[PDB]
Design a protein around this ligand. Structure first.
Ligand SMILES: Nc1ncnc2c1ncn2[C@@H]1O[C@H](COP(=O)(O)OP(=O)(O)O)[C@@H](O)[C@H]1O
Lengths: 225, 62, 290
């Protein structure tokens, strides 16, 4: 993971991330953060409106938020970035929409999706592949059943795949992916049902100590709440 | 001595004959899915090792 | 870096520069704004670090174009096509195969396809370590329900499932290519040529065999297997004739690498330990290459 692009230059801490917020507000002050969260909710609902998978919605949210970490909302207006990020996200991991077919499905006239494209990749500094918690969902959908056999796969296929997915979309709306690795965010959002699942998972798994990982998941839950 | 790959081995375990996944185990029963070389353990080895990538901390960031 | 000298490449898609130890690759931006095969080739070559896949020092933005960096020295294709038989089957056939499979396994364990493998894609270095580069039609290994493309790799280095038309394949199509790199290296000839048509299927059937129902199953689900008839697969009389410059353990992992079965095709985790490098002699990276 340390060789990946998300770790070596866009994974932060709380002091480093708050320093990043105050330097992009100092080179360009509290209304910007809930403004970009509101427009992130806007780009989330218009990306879900036009029948996209959950992978490309997550990359669009991450591209929009990573664009506005390096630039503020006044010298680049956020009402025009929200149509470009869906275009670079669908052209990123091969969605394959065309430009005119994307323009007729949106409120764009082919010019408003392409002028804020070079500078979005410049401010993004070309970290165009992102790791997302949905493959840790499909991994810990299976590693629960391998190590445990007592109470499995009745409620865990009843009400987990339809709930933790929406909780991680709400997590990507918040500021958690710059803090912890996507398996840690996955195990944080799996702690909604912590009656017998997560504690019995991490105690019997045990090179990696358990209690440090429980404290990491617990402070990630303190972040997400 | 020598090593073929210098550092390329993870130590975790896997057991593909246990799971009841409703997205790949039903997907492999079709005709054209098998014909492109798809089997269940390759997808599970792809996704379970991705589920364990990066169990570090925020202390290892400075 | 902001350093340039004389140009390489007559292709209209990209003309690569040179300078410093590096080579600036420029994608001409001036339909769509940015092509698929520019972000598609920076987004996976950014995140790999290995001594067998080249890396980016800087990806600094031009006025209209996109700049990358590359490697100085020429490639494996000019090594094979023009020499006076320097390459010898004791040691020179083993080290380059070992390093190319190391690069292919580093691509595979990042779950990135890299479906463009040629001797003009495999390039050497001043210390002679062969590299894996030019990720122009690469793709991450997606969800299993996602439809991929078809014609993604070149004609002479094409997996037979891509001949048959496999829409959503696995990452075993790039072990067939490096097995053809093995045979092209130990035969010093372009292996399996086609006449710019569907004739690659007939020459692959003539060389390694029309797959039968008993062995690679579900090959008749492509609407192409009924067009032709069966051909005999080669027996082990190929050990002397047409492959006389080879060892005993080279044909074992060559035949395991040129399996037309993609499920039973040997992945790189069982090609780096396929007891062929364990046989004497040990390889060594000083090779007489100009
Ligand atoms: N690092 C390099 N050093 C020297 N020449 C290079 C280098 N990289 C590319 N070239 C040249 O650039 C061209 C590759 O461009 P391209 O057509 O896109 O590759 P491909 O045929 O695999 O699709 C080749 O002619 C190659 O000789």
């Amino acid at each position: 993971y340390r060789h990946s692009s998300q770790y070596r230059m866009w994974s932060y801490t709380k002091d480093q991330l708050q320093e990043k917020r105050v330097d992009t507000n100092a080179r360009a002050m509290e209304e910007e953060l809930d403004l970009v969260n509101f427009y992130a909710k806007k780009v989330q609902v218009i990306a879900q409106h036009l029948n996209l998978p959950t992978e490309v919605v997550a990359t669009a949210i991450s591209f929009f938020r990573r664009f506005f970490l390096e630039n503020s909302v006044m010298q680049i207006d956020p009402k025009s970035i929200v149509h470009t990020t869906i275009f670079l996200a669908c052209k990123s991991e091969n969605y394959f929409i065309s430009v005119d077919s994307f323009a007729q499905k949106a409120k764009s006239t082919r010019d408003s999706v392409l002028k804020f494209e070079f500078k979005l990749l410049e401010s993004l500094k070309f970290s165009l592949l992102n790791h997302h918690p949905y493959k840790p969902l499909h991994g810990f959908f299976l590693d629960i059943q391998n190590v445990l056999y007592g109470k499995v796969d009745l409620n865990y296929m009843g009400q987990i795949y339809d709930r933790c997915k929406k909780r991680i979309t709400a997590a990507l709306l918040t500021d958690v992916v710059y803090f912890y690795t996507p398996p840690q965010i996955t195990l944080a959002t799996l702690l909604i049902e912590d009656e017998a699942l997560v504690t019995r998972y991490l105690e019997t798994k045990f090179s990696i100590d358990s209690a440090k990982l429980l404290t990491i998941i617990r402070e990630c839950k303190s972040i997400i709440e | 001595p020598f090593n073929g790959d210098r550092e390329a081995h993870p130590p975790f375990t896997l057991k593909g004959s246990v799971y009841n996944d409703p997205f790949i185990k039903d997907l492999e029963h079709r005709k054209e899915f098998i014909a492109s070389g798809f089997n269940t353990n390759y997808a599970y080895e792809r996704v379970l090792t991705e589920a364990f990538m990066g169990l570090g901390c925020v202390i290892s960031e400075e | 870096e902001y350093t340039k000298e004389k140009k390489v490449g007559e292709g209209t898609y990209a003309v690569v520069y040179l300078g410093c130890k590096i080579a600036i690759k420029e994608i001409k931006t001036s339909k769509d704004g940015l092509d698929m095969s520019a972000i598609r080739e920076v987004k996976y070559l950014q995140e790999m670090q290995h001594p067998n896949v080249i890396e980016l020092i800087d990806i600094f933005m031009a006025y209209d174009n996109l700049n990358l960096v590359l490697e100085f020295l020429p490639t494996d294709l000019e090594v094979v096509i023009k020499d006076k038989s320097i390459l010898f089957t004791p040691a020179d056939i083993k080290a380059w195969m070992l390093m190319t499979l190391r690069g292919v396994y580093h691509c595979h364990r990042n779950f990135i396809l890299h479906r463009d493998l040629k001797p003009n894609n495999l390039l050497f270095s001043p210390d002679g370590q062969i590299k894996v580069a030019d990720f122009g039609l690469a793709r991450a290994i997606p969800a299993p329900h996602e439809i991929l493309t078809s014609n993604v790799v070149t004609r002479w280095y094409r997996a037979p499932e891509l001949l048959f038309g496999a829409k959503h394949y696995t990452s075993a199509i790039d072990i067939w290519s490096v097995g053809v790199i093995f045979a092209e290296l130990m035969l010093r000839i372009p292996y399996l040529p086609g006449q710019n048509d569907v004739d690659q299927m007939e020459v692959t059937f003539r060389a390694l065999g029309t797959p039968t129902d008993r062995d690679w199953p579900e090959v008749s689900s492509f609407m192409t297997y009924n067009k032709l008839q069966i051909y005999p697969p080669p027996s082990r009389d190929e050990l002397r004739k047409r492959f006389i410059a080879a060892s005993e353990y080279a044909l074992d992992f060559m035949c395991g690498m040129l399996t037309m079965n993609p499920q039973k095709r040997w992945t790189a985790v069982q090609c780096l330990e396929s007891d062929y490098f364990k046989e004497l002699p040990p390889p060594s990276d000083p090779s007489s290459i100009k």
